[PDB]
Design a protein around this ligand. Sequence first.
Ligand SMILES: Oc1ccc(Sc2ccc(O)cc2)cc1
Length: 213
Amino acid sequence: KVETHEFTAEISQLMSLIINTVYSNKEIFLRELISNASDALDKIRYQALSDPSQLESEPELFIRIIPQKDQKVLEIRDSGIGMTKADLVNNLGTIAKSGTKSFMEALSAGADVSMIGQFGVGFYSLFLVADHVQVISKHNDDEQYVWESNAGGKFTVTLDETNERLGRGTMLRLFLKEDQLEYLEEKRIKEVVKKHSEFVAYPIQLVVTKEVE
Ligand SMILES: Oc1ccc(Sc2ccc(O)cc2)cc1
């Protein structure tokens, strides 16, 4: 059951700008998504300080990076607070109208794209390396949903009947551009994490698939 929605115009504008930019330091996308994951984990930790049972849906707090070489997909999963269906529509398709406009104005003045996080819209940096994204999310007391975008003007939200259960949290599935496949490689991912994400309160786990010989 696929619900189609339209992006706020200025979010559409910024996705188009990012997906087309030729910026040469695209690895900063991973810092931004890890920072979003850490923020989500902060929120469930805050709730769990009052009510520890909120952790029981997924007791381990983590950020996990899962390259899917066969699919040309990079997944970034967290066990943070997650997003409801209404959140997905609101958080990703509408709110952040302010940050997107201020950031585009800053770009026109000469700002570096790596400053995107300071306007609160670092999520959209994923379009530096991906042309399509699914956001799978599960909030306590709500169902698991999938939000899907191709940087155009429409997104969809669907009850998730096809992905692994998250327990609680969010998984971004980045469909990488054909010239950005370096970010499926263990060595490259490690380099970028160590360079830009040294001060993160949660374990950053990398899933590596190796042949037994
Ligand atoms: O204040 C909040 C509330 C929910 C989240 S969920 C999430 C969203 C995007 C993302 O790239 C990773 C996780 C994050 C911060």
